[PDB]
Amino acid sequence: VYRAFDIYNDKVAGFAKFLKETIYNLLKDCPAVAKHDRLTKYTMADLVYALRHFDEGNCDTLKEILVTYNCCDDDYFNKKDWYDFVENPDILRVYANLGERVRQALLKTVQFCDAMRNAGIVGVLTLDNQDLNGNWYDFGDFIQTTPGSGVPVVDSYYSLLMPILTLTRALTAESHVDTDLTKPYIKWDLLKYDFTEERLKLFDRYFKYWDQTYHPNCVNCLDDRCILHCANFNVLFSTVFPPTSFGPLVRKIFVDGVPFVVSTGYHFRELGVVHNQDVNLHSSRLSFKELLVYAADPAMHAASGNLLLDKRTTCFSVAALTNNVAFQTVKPGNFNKDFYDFAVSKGFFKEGSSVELKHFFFAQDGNAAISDYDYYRYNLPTMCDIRQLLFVVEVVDKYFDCYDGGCINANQVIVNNLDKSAGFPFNKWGKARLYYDSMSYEDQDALFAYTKRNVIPTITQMNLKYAISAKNRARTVAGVSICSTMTNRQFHQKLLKSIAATRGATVVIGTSKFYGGWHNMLKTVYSDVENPHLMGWDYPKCDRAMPNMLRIMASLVLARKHTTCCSLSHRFYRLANECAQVLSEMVMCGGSLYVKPGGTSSGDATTAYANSVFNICQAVTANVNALLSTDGNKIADKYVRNLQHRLYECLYRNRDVDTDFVNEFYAYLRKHFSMMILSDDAVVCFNSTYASQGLVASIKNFKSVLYYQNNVFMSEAKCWTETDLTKGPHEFCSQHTMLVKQGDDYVYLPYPDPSRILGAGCFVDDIVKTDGTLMIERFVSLAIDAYPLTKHPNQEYADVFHLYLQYIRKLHYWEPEFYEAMYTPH
Amino acid sequence: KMSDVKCTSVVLLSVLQQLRVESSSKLWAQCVQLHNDILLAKDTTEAFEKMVSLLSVLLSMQG
């Protein structure tokens, strides 16, 4: 029977399944050792593997572990979709049943550490030695040294074990007095916010053998890698403290007489407690900058609003700024009957037709915004494998090495469309136009200098969009405050623009689909990849269930372009403002203020590029997990065996940025796993033989990585695999493709779903009911979007463009060439 | 057949919302539920069975 081993030799390295000296006398004192001449069937490495390589049809190990440790009975697995987290959230509890067990192992590990420290023994703590009860064995690779000076190696152990610490909530007992589940919850003093001593106590109690120094407050970190490490720890150490202790730290400030309440800090769940630097108690004759920061500060708002208890959502509410709850509903889209009769009169919407109207402007009742914001309950605190994360962040920054970024002045901003809202605490007096025409350049520069040394919490107003959809969800938008997005632009609009103006890259934000651009992108993805197959995925609820750690990783990768214009303190305070504004900030539904658990706001200035960083992170992570989860003695190519060995060595045996192997692995991926990433959509051309042997990512690897790291189960309905390259990507940005002849050369054209363009034709969201001229350009744009359907083999699909043409004819762009010159490269 | 009932239900909830039906959440919720249930309908039987209910909700008032 195959057993999960964390093997590392001079010939094979990796955490994968394998088909398989008088030192024991110096360790019998510690109770964390088995009696060597008793054991359990499954070791802890088996649990970590089955929970990090989770797939269907082969999850028998996880099932036999869950039904053997009193987690859920055998008739709990007959239920369909018992493993998903979005659907069936009760599995969380079924996982938490293992948590305490895991915690015991942790404590036993520390005991063993002290034993190896007292007995003076060196050696690696391999996961396949610790029993699921908590006992260690197999003392064959340990060297005896002077007693009192031998140290063990726990890098690989704790690193591989970190995900299941927050997946099963092994630290759920630290909320109970005397650390026992049979005791009441620790009545933490409401005024306690520091928790630094408690974090250090938990670290010394669970990770005493952790060699790298850990700072509970991340302001004391050394580099971005140190911030990632310490935040990955604080993620686990913040699941034990009262959830009402985090968030912005406020105090009474004295403003020209009457006192105010101003936030002079922020106790993040990942970045420890971060105090403001440019603070002053006696403030008189404040300027417009400080007044705007105080308005956007939730300190003033939540300090004078009625305490709120919203049982509708499990999210931690804060207050209600308005004396009555606002129930905003989504109206149904107006109907354009002219186009509908024009379509039915030309042989459309018939019985059994291949094209059928499926996209509608769905209406939603007064429980739309709240019940959709409640989808954040899928955002669970996730402790990522910190060595794996610290290497994947390097490979990901290598994926972003071609661009160039840095802090820009306020006069060189390229902000567009100043006719949109500016968050909650400012939309009562105007749009972003007023706040961009009022603050002069020195005011915006001073505000950016302020957010470069402080933390400015903001209130991202959650509004309901009015767009078409093929599903019944509400799909709310999160309008961030103007104070947050202004600084985010000044800090990021040099790297974002450079991503939006670079072709042939992995990130295809900014690259147009028109003028043969789709062919450019597809041929770039192909890029002479041997044995090519295409693969695509769409992250289930990426806006909600994205962990805080990977969002911090994304913001750090996006901030790695300031190696000259920003200090370490400046970069950390910018990351803190990011976390306090777009990661765990407090949102506003109607007039009621809640605390977003951990979701990544979809309204951030840098939402698309940060989501692209996160997608590349997940893809590189799937690649490294597939490369490590393969038997080294079975890989035929010796170069790939050496690559996997050096990968394990750079992960769980090294601590510096091995730029040599970082670049080597980046080249290996970009030559064997070529990605096209638009912010959640990813089309990868990968090698057939490599994925079949397991040397690159696949569908199963992405599913497993999303299971243990992203905390969602990627259903097979949102992923796809294209075998032949003649047919392009089955879907990218909901734009199917096909190889069509246009100018004596077979190119690729993006054709949307005919149902979508038909629904855009018939149903109107209060646009055409005002005038008849807007219909003209609206249908011109729809024909531009729907032209490629003509080259489709199905005639019912092709007639959509002809129908749109015949409708534009009666204007009272007509030619079928203004919609074909959109796809000739020029 | 299906497109006709879907489109008339769309315009029906449009005129309902214009009839200040959103001022009564108990009824607006049922209207919205019927709307979103028939917009995903795959059989004409259930589509009509819910369209008649939406129509009865419409004619309940003198509009």
Partner: peptide, 28 residues
């Protein structure tokens, strides 16, 4: 507002369903 009611009525009459017809005769 009257245009929407008229187009709704015309679409309902174009539907010409038995149950819808009974409903529209009971309403009128």
């Amino acid at each position: 507002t009257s245009a929407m009611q008229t187009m709704l009525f015309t679409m309902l009459r174009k539907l010409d369903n038995d149950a819808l017809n009974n409903i529209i005769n009971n309403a009128r």
